[PDB]
Design an enzyme around this catalytic site. Structure first.
Site, PDB file in Angstrom:
ATOM      1  N   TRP A  49     -77.986  -7.405  32.581  1.00  0.00           N
ATOM      2  CA  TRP A  49     -77.744  -8.810  32.862  1.00  0.00           C
ATOM      3  C   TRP A  49     -78.926  -9.481  33.043  1.00  0.00           C
ATOM      4  CZ3 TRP A  49     -75.372  -4.822  35.891  1.00  0.00           C
ATOM      5  CH2 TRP A  49     -75.791  -4.786  37.260  1.00  0.00           C
TER       6      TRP A  49
ATOM      7  N   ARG B 221     -84.737  -2.593  38.352  1.00  0.00           N
ATOM      8  CA  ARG B 221     -84.704  -1.252  38.413  1.00  0.00           C
ATOM      9  C   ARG B 221     -83.921  -0.612  39.509  1.00  0.00           C
ATOM     10  NH1 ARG B 221     -90.645   0.848  37.572  1.00  0.00           N
ATOM     11  NH2 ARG B 221     -91.236  -1.354  38.224  1.00  0.00           N
TER      12      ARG B 221
ATOM     13  N   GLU C  77     -85.036 -16.035  33.383  1.00  0.00           N
ATOM     14  CA  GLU C  77     -85.173 -15.606  32.065  1.00  0.00           C
ATOM     15  C   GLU C  77     -84.602 -16.757  31.091  1.00  0.00           C
ATOM     16  OE1 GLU C  77     -84.426 -11.534  31.010  1.00  0.00           O
ATOM     17  OE2 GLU C  77     -83.668 -11.469  32.908  1.00  0.00           O
TER      18      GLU C  77
ATOM     19  N   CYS D 150     -89.922  -4.105  34.621  1.00  0.00           N
ATOM     20  CA  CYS D 150     -88.535  -4.391  34.854  1.00  0.00           C
ATOM     21  C   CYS D 150     -88.368  -4.384  36.344  1.00  0.00           C
ATOM     22  CB  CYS D 150     -87.589  -3.447  34.351  1.00  0.00           C
ATOM     23  SG  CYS D 150     -85.970  -3.752  34.539  1.00  0.00           S
TER      24      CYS D 150
HETATM   25  C1  HEM Z   1     -79.203  -4.351  34.964  1.00  0.00           C
HETATM   26  C2  HEM Z   1     -79.866  -5.802  35.279  1.00  0.00           C
HETATM   27  C3  HEM Z   1     -81.362  -6.149  34.528  1.00  0.00           C
HETATM   28  C4  HEM Z   1     -82.195  -7.015  34.958  1.00  0.00           C
HETATM   29  C5  HEM Z   1     -81.608  -8.022  35.941  1.00  0.00           C
HETATM   30  C6  HEM Z   1     -83.431  -6.876  34.535  1.00  0.00           C
HETATM   31  C7  HEM Z   1     -84.335  -7.621  34.517  1.00  0.00           C
HETATM   32  C8  HEM Z   1     -85.419  -7.635  33.902  1.00  0.00           C
HETATM   33  C9  HEM Z   1     -86.525  -8.775  33.478  1.00  0.00           C
HETATM   34  C10 HEM Z   1     -86.104 -10.243  34.448  1.00  0.00           C
HETATM   35  C11 HEM Z   1     -87.443  -8.246  32.712  1.00  0.00           C
HETATM   36  C12 HEM Z   1     -88.323  -9.117  32.068  1.00  0.00           C
HETATM   37  C13 HEM Z   1     -87.798  -9.841  30.840  1.00  0.00           C
HETATM   38  C14 HEM Z   1     -88.770 -11.002  30.313  1.00  0.00           C
HETATM   39  O1  HEM Z   1     -89.632 -11.678  31.178  1.00  0.00           O
HETATM   40  O2  HEM Z   1     -88.495 -11.324  29.147  1.00  0.00           O
HETATM   41  C15 HEM Z   1     -87.242  -7.081  32.454  1.00  0.00           C
HETATM   42  C16 HEM Z   1     -87.791  -6.343  31.697  1.00  0.00           C
HETATM   43  C17 HEM Z   1     -87.602  -4.931  31.124  1.00  0.00           C
HETATM   44  N1  HEM Z   1     -86.642  -4.127  31.426  1.00  0.00           N
HETATM   45 FE1  HEM Z   1     -85.101  -4.946  32.739  1.00  0.00          FE
HETATM   46  N2  HEM Z   1     -83.281  -5.537  33.920  1.00  0.00           N
HETATM   47  C18 HEM Z   1     -82.257  -4.902  33.787  1.00  0.00           C
HETATM   48  C19 HEM Z   1     -81.685  -3.745  33.101  1.00  0.00           C
HETATM   49  C20 HEM Z   1     -82.544  -3.160  32.296  1.00  0.00           C
HETATM   50  C21 HEM Z   1     -82.046  -2.198  31.548  1.00  0.00           C
HETATM   51  C22 HEM Z   1     -80.607  -1.485  31.434  1.00  0.00           C
HETATM   52  C23 HEM Z   1     -82.983  -1.395  30.861  1.00  0.00           C
HETATM   53  C24 HEM Z   1     -83.144  -0.534  29.887  1.00  0.00           C
HETATM   54  C25 HEM Z   1     -82.403   0.717  30.127  1.00  0.00           C
HETATM   55  C26 HEM Z   1     -84.073  -2.134  31.287  1.00  0.00           C
HETATM   56  C27 HEM Z   1     -85.660  -2.014  30.874  1.00  0.00           C
HETATM   57  C28 HEM Z   1     -86.399  -3.018  30.809  1.00  0.00           C
HETATM   58  C29 HEM Z   1     -87.604  -2.773  30.002  1.00  0.00           C
HETATM   59  C30 HEM Z   1     -88.181  -1.694  28.904  1.00  0.00           C
HETATM   60  C31 HEM Z   1     -88.390  -4.175  30.177  1.00  0.00           C
HETATM   61  C32 HEM Z   1     -89.701  -4.507  29.441  1.00  0.00           C
HETATM   62  C33 HEM Z   1     -89.312  -5.347  28.478  1.00  0.00           C
HETATM   63  C34 HEM Z   1     -90.372  -5.967  27.243  1.00  0.00           C
HETATM   64  O3  HEM Z   1     -91.713  -5.468  27.592  1.00  0.00           O
HETATM   65  O4  HEM Z   1     -90.225  -6.679  26.465  1.00  0.00           O
HETATM   66  N3  HEM Z   1     -83.812  -3.215  32.087  1.00  0.00           N
HETATM   67  N4  HEM Z   1     -85.898  -6.671  33.215  1.00  0.00           N
HETATM   68  C1  LIG Z   2     -81.983  -5.282  29.799  1.00  0.00           C
HETATM   69  C2  LIG Z   2     -82.516  -6.643  30.064  1.00  0.00           C
HETATM   70  C3  LIG Z   2     -82.067  -7.318  31.200  1.00  0.00           C
HETATM   71  C4  LIG Z   2     -82.784  -8.651  31.417  1.00  0.00           C
HETATM   72  N1  LIG Z   2     -83.483  -9.184  30.473  1.00  0.00           N
HETATM   73  C5  LIG Z   2     -83.798  -8.733  29.288  1.00  0.00           C
HETATM   74  C6  LIG Z   2     -84.508  -9.386  28.146  1.00  0.00           C
HETATM   75  C7  LIG Z   2     -86.047  -9.183  27.962  1.00  0.00           C
HETATM   76  C8  LIG Z   2     -86.546  -9.678  26.689  1.00  0.00           C
HETATM   77  C9  LIG Z   2     -88.098  -9.665  26.343  1.00  0.00           C
HETATM   78  C10 LIG Z   2     -88.263 -10.900  25.617  1.00  0.00           C
HETATM   79  O1  LIG Z   2     -89.580 -11.206  25.772  1.00  0.00           O
HETATM   80  C11 LIG Z   2     -90.254 -11.617  24.362  1.00  0.00           C
HETATM   81  C12 LIG Z   2     -90.601 -13.013  24.641  1.00  0.00           C
HETATM   82  N2  LIG Z   2     -92.095 -12.608  25.197  1.00  0.00           N
HETATM   83  C13 LIG Z   2     -92.576 -11.713  24.412  1.00  0.00           C
HETATM   84  C14 LIG Z   2     -91.398 -10.698  23.884  1.00  0.00           C
HETATM   85  C15 LIG Z   2     -91.163  -9.362  24.450  1.00  0.00           C
HETATM   86  C16 LIG Z   2     -92.503  -8.348  24.111  1.00  0.00           C
HETATM   87  C17 LIG Z   2     -93.203  -8.947  23.214  1.00  0.00           C
HETATM   88  C18 LIG Z   2     -94.441  -7.868  23.275  1.00  0.00           C
HETATM   89  C19 LIG Z   2     -95.579  -8.445  22.226  1.00  0.00           C
HETATM   90  C20 LIG Z   2     -94.695  -6.861  23.881  1.00  0.00           C
HETATM   91  C21 LIG Z   2     -93.609  -6.474  24.981  1.00  0.00           C
HETATM   92  N3  LIG Z   2     -93.813  -5.331  25.522  1.00  0.00           N
HETATM   93  N4  LIG Z   2     -92.504  -7.332  24.983  1.00  0.00           N
HETATM   94  C22 LIG Z   2     -83.259  -7.331  29.111  1.00  0.00           C
END
Ligand code: HEM
Ligand SMILES: Cc1ccnc(CCCCCO[C@H]2CNC[C@H]2Cc2cc(C)cc(N)n2)c1
Ligand code: HEM
Ligand SMILES: Cc1ccnc(CCCCCO[C@H]2CNC[C@H]2Cc2cc(C)cc(N)n2)c1
Ligand SMILES: C[C@H](O)[C@H](O)[C@H]1CNc2nc(N)[nH]c(=O)c2N1
Ligand SMILES: C[C@H](O)[C@H](O)[C@H]1CNc2nc(N)[nH]c(=O)c2N1
Ligand SMILES: [Zn+2]
Lengths: 411, 407
Positions: free
Chosen positions: A280, A111, A285, A108
């Site tokens: 947000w 953070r 993305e 993330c």
């Molecule tokens: C507040 C603005 C935030 C921004 C701009 C942001 C940005 C991002 C972005 C760009 C990603 C990668 C997403 C992707 O490529 O699909 C991500 C992943 C992630 N973020 Fe954030 N984030 C924010 C808030 C949060 C919040 C509130 C949480 C949880 C309380 C969070 C937890 C996570 C987690 C667990 C991932 C990994 C998601 C996955 O593996 O699918 N983030 N973040």
């Molecule tokens: C809170 C927040 C802030 C900014 N962006 C977001 C959206 C995150 C959405 C993640 C979407 O990702 C989709 C598209 N590719 C893999 C899938 C997520 C994923 C897939 C798998 C197999 C594992 C993993 N950790 N995460 C959420």
């Protein structure tokens, strides 16, 4: 032990000690790196150490380590585990735990924001209708008419693994995808299988390009139920370009609220299988991945045709050219409508300040370079040049299997 | 123990077994991933020799043959008696090609079996080194139709007689820190330029001065040589639409030729082994021109395009970046100097990975290096899971000679 990371643009070197608190495993060994791999029922015996380790961290953070309140709480949790096989978190511990899962999420980039997270305690919820109501309130609160606020809603923890709460949607707001008989896809290809489940469950599909999906909600291990989010609560942004007036006629829009709903939150060895959270968007993305991945809306060609770019050779960089204009359009559109969004320059620069602060005050910041570096313009963001260490801290968010693969249908 | 890699664009899954033959250590553990870190006796020698000769004899379908057994015997005898051994020409060429095949950070490996190997093991002096290197430069350049090549100087002995090319690439530009406080030229070469100046080079003190070679033979003190200017093919940078672009005064050299790495074959260590291919366009246009600590030209270009530089969110940097990269490719193509764009190069690498999986059981790849430094997710490698592990023969980083050398 001390591990060093270097920034190759600034020569700033940082020292990690926090990695010593990690115990969960990475996928990697001394003989193989699995850094680019996407994906690399508990006893009393295992639970008390996990609870103790969490409560020790919680009590340290409040500067009450080894106090009577700390010791009484360990004692109280110990007895609850031996008596009931599990335990309940205090509201304060739950809040701390959910903020920390975010702080520890190495993939993330956002953070810097981790300490400002609204936690909605939904552990008194019992039915899918109750879950629907909780989720609506989360969506309305987080949306805040465009001035987005981070929030998480936490439904009851896992008990025997036969009574799980789950949101079947991968995010609270997503667009339907429909595979046509001729093999094309209408709408979002990422959501075809979930859309099919919705339809089988009795959703009446409008069959357009941007149909907001219904929530499919499972309470207490029961079969999931369908609910439509009130459309007035679903904030959307039509995408236009500041200079190209034909851009609007592509008919693109996106939703303002990114809200991940398929992850599992672990705190103190407890497992919260339904914990939707929202923040947000960073513009890439939507503009890079959601619009331009070949397996998603795949709009690069149509955009480049309209820009009249030379498309006969990849070496004209037509794809890169169109990519940048789409991303300008997304940021312009969100900003013009006063819906919070952050560009990848601002977000990564803020992440680097966050990371240096973490190293200085916390002894480290686990980060997954593969995910932190934006999917366009990598090396003109400061994160590309930053060495990172990836390791797993708890509390944490984790992947879990999609529920349609594991659910026992009651019928 | 059998590992799967998935492409998330195509759903194609490949199975890796080749990793089990992996020898060296990655720097990662079960607790911590270091995937993004840039730098993570007679008794030792015979196992290394045997491992290599076994793979060689396997490759020519003669494993367990008398000629296999006889060579292992010959090599054992030679190490016992001499403390080292000599590779046969066939072995040296196989080893060099495989070191490239094994280079997990190299996107251009589809090309690995077309490598011209120049055997410079008979070289004894720095003047000899210079002669071999000019011939490599001229052969590889081939008037703009670039050809991959490596030149291999004598192997390490007792480690006090090392051959080294002190330069990091055969062709690089000088950097000078100015009274101004700014840097003139390439800031990446400031220290090396100073060493040259110290050793006697008369620096022209310009923005694009081709550095002289500092060659070390037989562990002697290194000596200076200027590469004949007529052998250094350079390209002036212009844009197909922006008339003003040429007035930035930008150019780059056509031949990328890495000269600071150590080639390890069958336990033998070749500390001077300059090798060259051709450029991927982003190497020059994204990294060399736009890194903050390199020529750092983004601001100047954005200004000439009259973009709104007030807010990062106008994506002015991203716009200028694409244009700078368009200009690099157009300039090389117009002058007929081989170059590859990041789309074509990564498409080829995916095809190469499939070949390697099908034909060899895998392909070590470092995703952090393989994904281009712009437009990552619009190239297919971004969506490809890769496994990174270390096979020998290999190219390895080694300490800069000036920290090591005693004068
Ligand atoms: C507040 C603005 C935030 C921004 C701009 C942001 C940005 C991002 C972005 C760009 C990603 C990668 C997403 C992707 O490529 O699909 C991500 C992943 C992630 N973020 Fe954030 N984030 C924010 C808030 C949060 C919040 C509130 C949480 C949880 C309380 C969070 C937890 C996570 C987690 C667990 C991932 C990994 C998601 C996955 O593996 O699918 N983030 N973040
Ligand atoms: C809170 C927040 C802030 C900014 N962006 C977001 C959206 C995150 C959405 C993640 C979407 O990702 C989709 C598209 N590719 C893999 C899938 C997520 C994923 C897939 C798998 C197999 C594992 C993993 N950790 N995460 C959420
Ligand atoms: C034929 C055209 C070639 C192309 C297009 C190419 C492409 C590339 C690229 C883009 C990089 C990353 C460089 C950087 O980011 O600084 C790289 C790294 C590398 N390549 Fe190649 N390559 C080619 C030929 C070769 C040859 C002929 C060899 C050896 C014989 C080789 C071995 C290596 C090694 C060892 C690295 C990592 C270098 C380091 O760690 O500093 N490549 N390649
Ligand atoms: C043969 C070929 C084909 C295409 N391009 C090239 C040029 C590669 C030159 C590599 C120079 O890059 C410099 C700047 N960043 C990493 C560094 C090389 C390097 C540096 C360090 C500290 C370690 C390492 N393993 N490799 C060579
Ligand atoms: C195979 C590879 O790890 C995969 O495509 C990753 C790369 N980096 C990513 N980075 C982010 N932020 N989100 C992603 O989905 C991915 N996908
Ligand atoms: C810290 C990080 O590993 C470093 O900036 C890397 C990232 N990826 C790279 N990729 C390539 N091809 N070349 C590089 O020099 C780098 N630098
Ligand atoms: Zn690793």
């Amino acid at each position: 032990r001390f591990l060093k990371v270097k920034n190759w643009e600034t020569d700033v070197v940082l020292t990690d000690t926090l990695h010593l608190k990690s115990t969960l495993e990475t996928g990697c060994t001394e003989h193989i790196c699995m850094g680019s791999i996407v994906l690399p029922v508990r006893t009393k015996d295992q639970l008390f150490p996990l609870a103790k380790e969490f409560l020790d961290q919680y009590y340290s953070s409040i500067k009450r380590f080894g106090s009577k309140a700390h010791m009484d709480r360990l004692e109280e949790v110990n007895k609850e585990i031996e008596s009931t096989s599990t335990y309940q978190l205090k509201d304060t511990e739950l809040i701390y735990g959910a903020k920390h899962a975010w702080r520890n999420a190495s993939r993330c980039v956002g953070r810097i924001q981790w300490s400002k997270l609204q936690v909605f305690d939904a552990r008194d919820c019992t039915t899918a209708h109750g879950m629907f109501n909780y989720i609506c309130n989360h969506v309305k609160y987080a949306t805040n008419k465009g001035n987005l606020r981070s929030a998480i809603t936490i439904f009851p923890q896992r008990t025997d693994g036969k009574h799980d709460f789950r949101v079947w949607n991968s995010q609270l707001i997503r667009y339907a995808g429909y595979k046509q008989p001729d093999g094309s896809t209408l709408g979002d290809p990422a959501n075809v299988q979930f859309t099919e489940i919705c339809i089988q469950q009795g959703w009446k599909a409008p069959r357009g390009r941007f149909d907001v999906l219904p929530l499919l909600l499972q309470a207490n291990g029961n079969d999931p139920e369908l609910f439509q989010i009130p459309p007035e609560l679903v904030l959307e942004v039509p995408i236009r370009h500041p200079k190209f007036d034909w851009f609007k006629d592509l008919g693109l829009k996106w939703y303002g609220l990114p809200a991940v709903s398929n992850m599992l939150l672990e705190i103190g060895g407890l497992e919260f299988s339904a914990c939707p959270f929202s923040g947000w968007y960073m513009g890439t993305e939507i503009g890079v991945r959601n619009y331009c991945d070949n397996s998603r809306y795949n709009i690069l060609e149509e955009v480049a045709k309209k820009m009249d770019l030379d498309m006969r050779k990849t070496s004209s960089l037509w794809k890169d050219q169109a990519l940048v204009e789409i991303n300008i359009a997304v940021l312009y559109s969100f900003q013009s409508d006063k819906v919070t969004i952050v560009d990848h320059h601002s977000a990564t620069e803020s992440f680097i300040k966050h990371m240096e602060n973490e190293y200085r005050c916390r002894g480290g910041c686990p980060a997954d370079w593969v995910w932190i570096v934006p999917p366009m313009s990598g090396s003109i963001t400061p994160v590309f040049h930053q060495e990172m260490l990836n390791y797993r801290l708890t509390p944490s968010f984790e992947y879990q299997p999609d529920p349609w693969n594991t659910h026992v249908w009651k019928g």
